[PDB]
Design a binder for these strands. Structure first.
Ligand code: CL
Ligand code: CL
Ligand code: K
Ligand code: MG
Ligand code: MG
Ligand code: MG
Ligand code: MG
Ligand code: MG
Ligand code: MG
Ligand code: MG
Ligand code: MG
Ligand code: MG
Ligand code: NA
Ligand code: NA
Ligand code: NA
Ligand code: NA
Ligand code: NA
Ligand code: NA
Ligand code: NA
Ligand code: NA
Ligand code: NA
Ligand code: NA
Ligand code: NA
Ligand code: NA
Ligand code: SR
Ligand code: SR
Ligand code: SR
Ligand code: SR
Ligand code: SR
Lengths: 65, 81, 194, 46, 119
RNA sequence: AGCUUUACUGCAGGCUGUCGCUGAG
RNA sequence: CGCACGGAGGCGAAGAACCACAGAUUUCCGAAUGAGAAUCUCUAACAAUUGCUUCGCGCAAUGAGGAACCCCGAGAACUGAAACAUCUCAGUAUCGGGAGGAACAGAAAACGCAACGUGAUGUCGUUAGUAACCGCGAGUGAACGCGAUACAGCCCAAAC
């Protein structure tokens, strides 16, 4: 949703990696909040974070990195 | 590629280790060694790991009890997540 | 004029006379000390090999195989059998020894395919045959107008399905007329009565 | 007995499979865990 | 070996091969056991060479007796690849025949005579 | 069906002759 | 936002869902191939067998699967004969090996309605329960030809 494909293809190879690490962290922090039973969740993002990471990785493969 | 750290293991027993022994507990990939758990943790939270104890749980996952150096404070590290 | 080959051929019409006799009596001493399947660099019977498809080319292989002489090595029945089916001694296999040799050779070279084979004699207890095998994957053969046919997929494991020359004869397919009622087009399609 | 790491993973799964059909699935499907195994009355593999 | 009934001295074999080399450059020579066999049968052979390291021996066994019933003289060469090199080949040769020498007929003739004597 | 034997008929196995391997005087 | 009609929340006019084609990812065991192991582990790997070979795993091949069909091998007994041994069940059941999308067969050392005739090979119909076999018992059992289907004829060895 928030992160579209164009935006990913416009990023530089180094920007996708940085973006990847950023996303992985939001994901890890969400799963941590979830582990603590924390409900300030918003179920859509934890699900969106996974797809975003999948997209970035797909593009990195497509673009040759 | 699989990541080392899955998520913080937060249970009453985990808290005691945090308050009383400056230890953090994690659910980690069962293919990870104590050394890999140590590094990954230092890099993710920027702290110094003194010792790592592991266990293959009856949940199919691996649990790691990571003690931090006196320089760091478990409660604080855990509090930011 | 006579080709040189005709001389090798003529010598083998009588492997027990002349120089050939002395040769065999010598060779077999070495052969008996060799294994079951020995790859050899050159055919012992050049005329016969060339006549069967052999070529001094890459991808063409020759191997001599020894197989025991005699009837079936059969175990006696261990359950009830009517008299007719109690035999052991006089039972012989339906595949001739030359065909057994071709199969043992092909197993040794899993990637190759049997092109043909021929006899190179025998002593009191065993027989030797030289088998010609072809590498269906070598371009030297894939480009040969006389051999590339053996590269087709349906020619895979041809020896094990009786597509060999010794296979077709042993299957009673030599005759096109009388006598081949139950052999052609296959033993199996004819209810196994050939 | 001594369980290997793999045997352990399997026992672990069997234990997890031994949970009940969540409350909401009942509502969602407008109305049974055909695989409820008891440690005593039943027997696992291996 | 089964077709070899006399040993040719190294020196003799040396002369012979040398004569063969001047035969390909001057006169004519046949390379290969099949072409050599036809020379003997056609009579166009003056001197035929037979390697002693041929395996199988069947390939050449016939040369000796064939030559005898054709007056054609023959000599043995210890190695197969030497005969082929002399004949001018990059490969070996189990047998070769000097089909009408040339500025070597003198030597060839002697070699023939040196062999008949060697029995 | 299991068992027996100088029941009927066969099949292994043992003994023995012969052919091949197998040659010189 | 699957089966699946909940709750919360999210995605979609930046055209989502959904369908077609193509591509990415594709853990471990598995022919399972570095070695060992009840799906894990130990210290760079075409293990094993082969072909070629720059003789170095450098380039290649094989392995296993598939509903049955197909080809090559091994091959019963109950049963029928109102007993039973040959015969029969049956080259069946089952076993070993192997190919393909179909297999196999195939351009006459054929046929032999004997001819001044036919003209590769499968298969279908028929020839026929005929010829032939058989304690001449019970049973077993073709072919040539003909009418069809489809059609297609070639390459070596050797001589030179
Ligand atoms: Cl084969
Ligand atoms: Cl006719
Ligand atoms: K019976
Ligand atoms: Mg431990
Ligand atoms: Mg058929
Ligand atoms: Mg529980
Ligand atoms: Mg009884
Ligand atoms: Mg392995
Ligand atoms: Mg009866
Ligand atoms: Mg009767
Ligand atoms: Mg019958
Ligand atoms: Mg007929
Ligand atoms: Na977990
Ligand atoms: Na093979
Ligand atoms: Na028959
Ligand atoms: Na139990
Ligand atoms: Na009984
Ligand atoms: Na996939
Ligand atoms: Na391979
Ligand atoms: Na190699
Ligand atoms: Na009866
Ligand atoms: Na009875
Ligand atoms: Na009968
Ligand atoms: Na007619
Ligand atoms: Sr638990
Ligand atoms: Sr195969
Ligand atoms: Sr019990
Ligand atoms: Sr050579
Ligand atoms: Sr036609």
């Amino acid at each position: 949703t928030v992160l579209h494909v164009q935006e990913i293809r416009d990023m530089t190879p180094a920007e996708r990696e940085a973006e990847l690490d950023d996303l992985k962290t939001e994901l890890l922090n969400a799963r941590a909040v979830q582990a603590a039973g924390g409900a300030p969740e918003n179920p859509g993002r934890i699900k969106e974070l996974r797809k975003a990471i999948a997209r970035i990785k797909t593009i990195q493969g497509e673009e040759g990195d | 590629s699989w990541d080392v750290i899955k998520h913080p293991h937060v249970t009453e027993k985990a808290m005691n280790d945090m308050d009383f022994q400056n230890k953090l507990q994690f659910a980690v990939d069962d293919r990870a060694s104590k050394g890999e758990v140590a590094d990954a943790v230092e890099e993710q939270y920027d702290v110094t790991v003194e010792q790592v104890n592991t266990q293959n749980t009856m949940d199919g996952e691996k649990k790691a009890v990571v003690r931090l150096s006196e320089d760091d404070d478990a409660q604080e590290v855990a509090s930011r997540i | 004029a006579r080709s040189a080959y005709s001389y090798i051929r003529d010598a083998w019409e009588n492997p027990g006379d002349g120089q050939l006799a002395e040769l065999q009596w010598q060779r077999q001493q070495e052969w008996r000390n060799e294994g079951a399947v020995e790859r050899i660099e050159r055919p012992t019977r050049l005329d016969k090999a060339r006549s069967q498809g052999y070529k001094a080319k890459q991808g063409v292989i020759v191997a001599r195989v020894s197989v025991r002489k005699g009837s079936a090595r059969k175990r006696r029945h261990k359950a009830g059998r009517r008299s007719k089916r109690q035999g052991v001694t006089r039972i012989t296999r339906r595949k001739d020894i030359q065909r057994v040799a071709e199969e043992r050779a092909s197993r040794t070279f899993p990637n190759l395919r049997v092109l043909n084979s021929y006899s190179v004699g025998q002593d009191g207890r065993q027989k030797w045959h030289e088998v010609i095998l072809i590498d269906p994957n070598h371009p030297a053969i894939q480009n040969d107008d006389d051999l590339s046919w053996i590269c087709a997929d349906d020619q895979a494991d041809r020896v094990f399905r009786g597509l060999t020359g010794a296979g077709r004869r042993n299957r009673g397919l030599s005759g096109k007329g009388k006598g081949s009622e139950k052999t052609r087009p296959s033993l199996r399609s004819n209810g196994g009565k050939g | 007995g001594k369980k290997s790491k793999a045997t352990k993973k399997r026992l672990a799964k069997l234990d997890n499979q031994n949970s009940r059909v969540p409350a909401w699935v009942m509502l969602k499907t407008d109305r049974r865990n055909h695989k409820r195994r008891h440690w005593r009355r039943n027997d696992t593999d291996e | 070996p089964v077709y070899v009934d006399f040993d040719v001295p190294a020196d003799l074999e040396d002369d012979a091969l040398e004569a063969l080399e001047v035969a390909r450059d001057t006169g004519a020579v046949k390379k290969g056991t099949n072409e050599t066999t036809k020379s003997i049968e056609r009579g166009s052979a003056e001197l035929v060479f037979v390697a002693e390291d041929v395996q199988p021996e069947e390939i050449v066994m016939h040369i000796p007796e064939l030559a005898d019933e054709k007056g054609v003289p023959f000599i043995f060469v210890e190695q197969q690849d030497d005969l082929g090199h002399a004949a001018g080949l990059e490969v070996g040769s189990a047998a070769a025949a000097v089909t009408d020498a040339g500025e070597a007929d003198a030597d060839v003739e002697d070699i023939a005579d040196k062999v008949e004597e060697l029995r």
